[PDB]
Design a protein around this ligand. Structure first.
Ligand SMILES: N[C@@H](CCNC(=O)N1CCn2c(ccc2C(F)(F)F)C1)Cc1cc(F)c(F)cc1F
Ligand SMILES: N[C@@H](CCNC(=O)N1CCn2c(ccc2C(F)(F)F)C1)Cc1cc(F)c(F)cc1F
Lengths: 727, 725
C-alpha cells in the first residue's frame, strides 16, 4: 500500500482539521462554516446564523480578515493585505453595519492602515495610520487624531518598530484599551539614532533597478530605540482642541541607562500595570499606576513597585510574564522562578514586596489562562513528570492544596498536549488536543466539568491515514551527569530495532526551546521516515526551557557552547542504541538551529557526514540587540566580547573539509540578514572548503511563499538522499 | 607519466614566460630583470643599468607600479593600489629624481589620486584628484588646479564615469596630451540624472552593518550621462588666475539628441581629431579642430567633417576606429568597412569626403600599428585565409600594390598569432608570438627586416611540458548555408577518432567575438582534456567578428537569437563527426557566454545534458545602455521592445527541467548585477525547476580573487565530473 510521500507534504494531501472560535459573551462563540459566520450557544447547543456567505458577494473585494465589535453592532472588514514583517501588515478597512444592512461610506478608515482594534466593550475604533493614532467613537463620525509626531522609520505611535515587534511584544500593536473603553494606553518609539540595515529587493522581472530596503535595526551593542508611554481619555475628545495625552515615565532605577517597555496590562478601570526592563536584562521593575481623578494625572506609587531580578541569567522565559489581577485589582497572580529555579505562580499583594507561591514542584507552569473569584486555571507540564506535555489544571483560591487536573485523564493515550480557550468570566471552555494522537477539539463547562460535546475529532483524517504507512513517534529521555534530557524520534513504519537506520538530527536548541514534545505533526520529517526510512531525531539539551533555570540558564553568556556540544553528544547516544548507521548521520536546522547545525559541522567531531543550514546566524554581532544581549550581554571588552568572538561559525571554517554542507538563505531576510550566510560562504571559500549553496530571491526568514516552500524542501530532500545514497 | 591536473592550473605550475618592454627612444627600451630596471640598446645589443633593485629597499612601501618621464629625468612611483572597476583605481604617488638621488618631499601628489600621466615630451604631470584636474610643470613646484566643478558620482573631470570606462574608452583616463605638451585636452562627464545601482558589500567579518555601494549606472533606455570637451594651455598657467579652458562643442547633427564622445586623437601640435556618436549608434561624425592662434579659440571646420554610418548595423567593431595622421597632419588613415562589408584601411584627405582603400579582400585589418613617411604597418587575418590568425604586414605608401608580410614565414608551424610593439618613429619593432606553439618574443629592425635576436623562446617551459601528456588543438571550419564557420577543439592526449568522448561547449558568442583562434593557452580546458578526457569545443557563429559585416551584423537588433541557435547547431555537427558521446554534451560560459549558455539550456533542444552559467545576463534591460543599445536599440514599443522582451532567460524557465543547471554569481558584481542571476533563480523556483546555485561574497564580474578563483573552478569541475560520471 501507499506511503507518506514528499508531495503529500508539499501539496498538503492529508489535512489536519482545526476548530477556530471567538468568544463574544460568557456563553456564546462564533464559528464560520461554508463562509457562513454562525453563532453557537453553549447553554442549549442550538446554533443561529449571524452572517450568511452571500452577504459580501457584491462587496467587490476578496475579504482577507474580519473583526466584529464586542456589542455585535459593527463588523470591521480587512482587505488588500500586504505583509510587512512577522506580525506587521498594512491593509484597507471597511465597516459594515449589522443593525442595518449598509456599508459605511462616510469618514472611512484610510488606505494603508497599519493597525485597527475595537474597544473591549461597545464599538469604539482605534487605528494607526502613517505612524499616528486616530480614534473613532462612532463608525460614521469623523476621527480624532491623537498623535502628530508620527514619522516613517523615525517615530512610532501605537505601533512597534522592527525590534519591539519581533523581540518584545510579539505583535505589531502598541495600543492598550482599558476594560471599559475609557482610556487608550499607547507607546511611542523613537528610532532616530537606530542604524539601518540595507538590502536589495528585486520584485518582478519588469522592475529595471533593484529597490534598496532600509529598516531601523539595532544589532548587538548598537544604538537602541527609546520608548515613551502615554495614556489619553477617549471620552473627553474635543473636536476643536488637540487631545491631551498624559505621559507616564519610567522609574529612576530604569532612567539610569537604556531600557525597554516589556509589558502593559490593565488592572481595573483606572489602574494600569507596566513592566520595564534594563538593557542588561537581569533586572525588571513593575509599576502600578492609578488615575488621580482630581488632577487628571497618572500616579505610580514607589510603595507599589515590584522588582524581578536574577544573578544566574535573564528575567523571564523570553520576557517578564504578564500579571493576572483579581476583580477588585488589589492583588495579582504572576509566574516567577522560585528559589530552586522552577517557574510557578506567585500571589502578590499590591503593597507587599514578598509573594506567596500557590504551586511548587520539579515542573513548571506554562501560563495562567483564566481567573475567577473561585478558581485560577493554568497549564503545566506536571502530569507524569513529562516536560513535553501540556495539561489544564484548576486551583482553588480558598484552598491551595486542592488542585484538579481537568484534562489529564480525558484521553490519556490520545491526548497529552492541551491548550485552552475560555469564555467571558470563564463559564465555558474549549480544550484543544494536539497530540500524540490526532487533534481533538472538545467543549466543556466550568461549573461541573462535564464534556458537553465533541467539536472536532479528525475521524475524517483517521480514515485516510489507515491506508497509509505512517511513522511512529517515540518520546524518551537519557541520563547525563545525573540529569534527565528528553529526546524524540520519528521512527520509520515497521521499525526493526535490529537493523541499522540513517539518522537526521532535527535541530533548534535555542534558549528556552522544546523540540521534544507530544505534539502530532505532519511535516518534512514524516516523509523522511515513511518513505526514505530515516530516523528524524530531536534533542532538548542545556539551554532548553520548561525544565527549570538550572537547565535553561546553563547557556547564559555562553551561546554556541553547551547547546552545540549537547547535540553532538546526543548523536553519540542514539548510535549507542544500536539501530543507527553511524556512517550516515546528518544534521539540519533553521534560524537558531541553522547556527547550531553550522557550529556542529565545524566542531570536527567527525560524527556527522552532512548537514543543512537554512537562514543561520553566523556571528552574534550581526543579530539584533534585544535577543542577543538577553543571553550574551554587550559585545564590549569590559562585558562579554570574548564569548562573542569565540562563538562564530567563520572561525570553525577549516573543519568543514570533513563534511558536506548545504547553506541556504533568502536574499530579502529582514530577520537574519543574508550578511550572516555571506560571511560563512566567504570564510569557507577562503580556506578552500567546497560546499553547497542556494539563495532565494526576495524571500524572508520563513521562505514561506508557495513556490519557494516547495523548491527548498525538494532541494533539501535531494541533498539528503544523495548523502545517504538513496535512489 | 604525469598529466595536466587541476592544481597545475590553479597553482600555476607551468608558467608562460613574457617579455614586457617600454620604448623610450627610437632605439632604446626598458626591461626589468631581478627587480633591476635596465635599458637595452637595439643598435649594438649592449644593456646598461638604469635603476638597481636595492634603490627602493628603504622606500618603506611595496612599489605597486612605476612610470618614467619621457626625458628620463623623473620616475613616478605608484603604491597603495586600491582597485575600483575594470580599469579604474585609486593610489598614492611619489616622484623620485633620477638626475640626483632624492625623493621629492615638496608639493607631493595627494593620497587617493585617481589618475596620473606624464606629458609625451619632458616631465609635465597631469593628475586627477577628487574628480578635478591638476597640472604640474615641475615635480617639486605647486600644482595648478584646472577644474573646480568636480563632484563625486556627479561630475567627472579628466576621468571616465562607469559607463564610459567600461563601454567607450576602455580606460579610466579622460585626459589627452598634445604631442609637444602644450595642450591638455580633457572630457567632462555629468551623471546628475543617471540612475544609481545599489548593492551590498560585506567586507571583513568585523564589519557589523553591510555597506551599500551606489554607482551611477545607465541601464538600457535610461538617462545617459552628458559629455563636454575642453582644452587648456599648460604653458600660460597663472599662479594668481584660474586657468581658462576652451570648450569645443559637438556638431549640430549630434546636439539634436543624446550622444557619446567616442574618440580623441591628436593630429599635430595645434590640430585635434574628435569623434562623436549618436545614442542610436549607426551614425558617427568626426571633427578636425585647429587652434586659432590670434583669438585663442578652437575651430572645427564644417568642410573637414567626415561621416560614418551603417544601415545594416552599428558603426565600428565596438566603436569607430582611431585615425592615424601623417606627419604634416593633412591626411589620415582609418579602418572602415567597405562596400562588401570588410574592414580595411581607407586613406582620407582632410577636406575630401571620399576616401581611397589601400587594402581589399575577403579578410579584415585588425589595427594600424605604426606610420612612417615610407611605410604603414598593420595586422590582419589574411594569411592562408584564417580569421583566427594574426600577422604583421607592411604597405608601401608610394605603391599600394606592394605588400610584404614580415611575420608570415618566420616560424609558420609555431607562430600564427602576432602582436607588435614599435619604437619611436618605427625604427625597431618587437614581434610577440602567442600560438599555436609556445610564445616567442623576437626583436627586429624595420630598415632591412632582419631578426636581430630572440628575447624569449620559452624553452624552459618546453623542457617541462615534454614530461606532461598535453592535449592537442585542432582549428577547422564547417560549412553552413554556403558560409565558412570556424571552430576549435581541445582534444585529449592520444586522441582516438574511433572512440566516443564527452564534449564541453566553451561559449562566448558575443557581438564581434572570436573563440576560435591560433593562440596557445594553459587554462581550465587544458585540465579537462588532459586529465578528464573531455573535448572542449568553441565555435564562432553569426555575430562573431573579423569575418565581415555579413557575419558580424547578423545578430543586429536580434541578440539571443542566431548566436544562440548557432551554438546548438555547432554541437550537432560535432557529434556528426562521430567521436562525440551525444549522451554527454555540456555547455558553459561567462558574462555574455553565460547568457548564451542559459538561453541554450532553455531552448529545449535536448542536445545538452548540463551547463554552467557564470555571471550571466538574463534580460537586456538590466545591462548598461552603451553596450545593449549598440546592438539592440532602445527598449521602447516604438523602437525594439519586442526583441527585448523575447530574449530573456526567464521566459525559457520551463525547459530547464530537461537539464542540470549550475548558476554562479558574485554578490558585488558592478558590471553584470546579481539582479540578473536573482531573476533567473526566481523564475526557475516559480515553475518548480530544480537547479544548482553558488553566490560569491564580495566578488566582482571576474571572480578573480585568489581564493575565489580556485574555489569556483574546483566547484565547476566537480559539477562537470558528476554530470559526465
Ligand atoms: N526572534 C526570536 C524569538 C524567540 N521566540 C519568541 O519570542 N517567542 C516564542 C515562544 N514564546 C514567546 C514568548 C514567550 C514564549 C514562551 F513562553 F516560550 F512560550 C515568543 C527567534 C529567533 C532566534 C534566532 F536565533 C534567530 F536567528 C532568529 C529568530 F527569529
Ligand atoms: N562590456 C563588454 C566589453 C566587450 N569588449 C570590448 O569592448 N572591447 C574588447 C575588444 N575590442 C574593444 C574595442 C575594439 C576591440 C577589438 F577590435 F575587438 F579588438 C573593446 C564585455 C561584457 C559583455 C557583456 F555582454 C556583459 F554582460 C558583461 C561584459 F563585461
Amino acid at each position: 500500500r501507499k506511503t507518506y510521500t514528499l508531495t503529500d507534504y508539499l501539496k498538503n494531501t492529508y489535512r489536519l482539521k482545526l476548530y477556530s472560535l471567538r468568544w463574544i459573551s460568557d456563553h456564546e462563540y462564533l464559528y464560520k462554516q461554508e463562509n457562513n459566520i454562525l453563532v453557537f450557544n453553549a447553554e442549549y447547543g442550538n446554533s443561529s446564523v449571524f452572517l450568511e456567505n452571500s452577504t459580501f458577494d457584491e462587496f467587490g473585494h476578496s475579504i482577507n480578515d474580519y473583526s466584529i465589535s464586542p456589542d455585535g453592532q459593527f463588523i470591521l472588514l480587512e482587505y488588500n493585505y500586504v505583509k510587512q514583517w512577522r506580525h506587521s501588515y498594512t491593509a484597507s478597512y471597511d465597516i459594515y453595519d449589522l443593525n442595518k444592512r449598509q456599508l459605511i461610506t462616510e469618514e472611512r478608515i484610510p488606505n494603508n492602515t497599519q493597525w485597527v482594534t475595537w474597544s473591549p466593550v461597545g464599538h469604539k475604533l482605534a487605528y494607526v495610520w502613517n505612524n499616528d493614532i486616530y480614534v473613532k467613537i462612532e463608525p460614521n463620525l469623523p476621527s480624532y487624531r491623537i498623535t502628530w509626531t508620527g514619522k516613517e522609520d523615525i517615530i512610532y505611535n501605537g505601533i512597534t518598530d522592527w525590534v519591539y515587534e519581533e523581540e518584545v511584544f510579539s505583535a505589531y500593536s502598541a495600543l492598550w484599551w482599558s476594560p471599559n473603553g475609557t482610556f487608550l494606553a499607547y507607546a511611542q518609539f523613537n528610532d532616530t539614532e537606530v542604524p539601518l540595515i540595507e538590502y536589495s529587493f528585486y520584485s518582478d522581472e519588469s522592475l529595471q533597478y533593484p529597490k534598496t530596503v532600509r529598516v531601523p535595526y539595532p544589532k548587538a551593542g548598537a544604538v537602541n530605540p527609546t520608548v515613551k508611554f502615554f495614556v489619553v481619555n477617549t471620552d473627553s475628545l474635543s473636536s476643536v482642541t488637540n487631545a491631551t495625552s498624559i505621559q507616564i515615565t519610567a522609574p529612576a532605577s530604569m532612567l539610569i541607562g537604556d531600557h525597554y517597555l516589556c509589558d502593559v496590562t490593565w488592572a481595573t478601570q483606572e489602574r494600569i500595570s507596566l513592566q520595564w526592563l534594563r538593557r542588561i536584562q537581569n533586572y525588571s521593575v513593575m509599576d502600578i499606576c492609578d488615575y488621580d481623578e482630581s488632577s487628571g494625572r497618572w500616579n505610580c506609587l514607589v510603595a507599589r513597585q515590584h522588582i524581578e531580578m536574577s544573578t544566574t541569567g535573564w528575567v523571564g522565559r523570553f520576557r517578564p510574564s504578564e500579571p493576572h489581577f483579581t476583580l477588585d485589582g488589589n492583588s495579582f497572580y504572576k509566574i516567577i522562578s522560585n528559589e530552586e529555579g522552577y517557574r510557578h505562580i506567585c500571589y502578590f499583594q499590591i503593597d507587599k514586596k514578598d509573594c506567596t507561591f500557590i504551586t511548587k514542584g520539579t515542573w513548571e507552569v506554562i501560563g495562567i489562562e483564566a481567573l475567577t473569584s473561585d478558581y485560577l486555571y493554568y497549564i503545566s507540564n506536571e502530569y507524569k513528570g513529562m516536560p513535553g506535555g501540556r495539561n489544564l489544571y484548576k486551583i482553588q483560591l480558598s484552598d491551595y492544596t486542592k488542585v484538579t487536573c481537568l484534562s489529564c485523564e480525558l484521553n490519556p493515550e490520545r491526548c497529552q498536549y492541551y491548550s485552552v480557550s475560555f469564555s467571558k468570566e470563564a463559564k465555558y471552555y474549549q480544550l484543544r488536543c494536539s497530540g500524540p494522537g490526532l487533534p481533538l477539539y472538545t467543549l466543556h463547562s466550568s461549573v461541573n466539568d462535564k464534556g458537553l460535546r465533541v467539536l472536532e475529532d479528525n475521524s475524517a483524517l483517521d480514515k485516510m491515514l489507515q491506508n497509509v504507512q505512517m511513522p511512529s513517534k517515540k518520546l524518551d529521555f537519557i541520563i547525563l551527569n545525573e540529569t534527565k534530557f528528553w529526546y524524540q524520534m520519528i521512527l520509520p513504519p515497521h521499525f526493526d530495532k535490529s537493523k541499522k537506520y540513517p539518522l537526521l538530527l532535527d535541530v533548534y536548541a535555542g534558549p528556552c526551546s522544546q523540540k521534544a514534545d507530544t505534539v502530532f505533526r505532519l511535516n518534512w520529517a514524516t516523509y523522511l521516515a515513511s518513505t526514505e526510512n530515516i530516523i528524524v531525531a530531536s534533542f532538548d539539551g542545556r539551554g532548553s526551557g520548561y525544565q527549570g533555570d538550572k537547565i535553561m540558564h546553563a547557556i547564559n553568556r555562553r551561546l554556541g557552547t553547551f547547546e552545540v556540544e549537547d547535540q553532538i553528544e546526543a548523536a553519540r547516544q542514539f548510535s549507542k542504541m544500536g539501530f543507527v548507521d553511524n556512517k550516515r548521520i546528518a544534521i539540519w536546522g533553521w534560524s537558531y538551529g541553522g547556527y547550531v547545525t553550522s557550529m556542529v559541522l565545524g566542531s570536527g567531531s567527525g560524527v556527522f557526514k552532512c548537514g543543512i543550514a537554512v537562514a543561520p546566524v553566523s556571528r552574534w554581532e550581526y543579530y539584533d540587540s534585544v535577543y542577543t544581549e538577553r543571553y550574551m550581554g554587550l559585545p564590549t571588552p569590559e562585558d562579554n566580547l570574548d564569548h562573542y568572538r569565540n562563538s562564530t561559525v567563520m572561525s570553525r571554517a577549516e573543519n568543514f573539509k570533513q563534511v558536506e554542507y548545504l547553506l541556504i538563505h533568502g536574499t530579502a531576510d529582514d530577520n537574519v540578514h543574508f550578511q550572516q550566510s555571506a560571511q560563512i560562504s566567504k570564510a569557507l571559500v577562503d580556506v578552500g572548503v567546497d560546499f553547497q549553496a542556494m539563495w532565494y530571491t526576495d524571500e524572508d526568514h520563513g521562505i514561506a511563499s508557495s513556490t519557494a516552500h516547495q523548491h527548498i524542501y525538494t532541494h533539501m530532500s535531494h541533498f539528503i538522499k544523495q548523502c545517504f545514497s538513496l535512489p
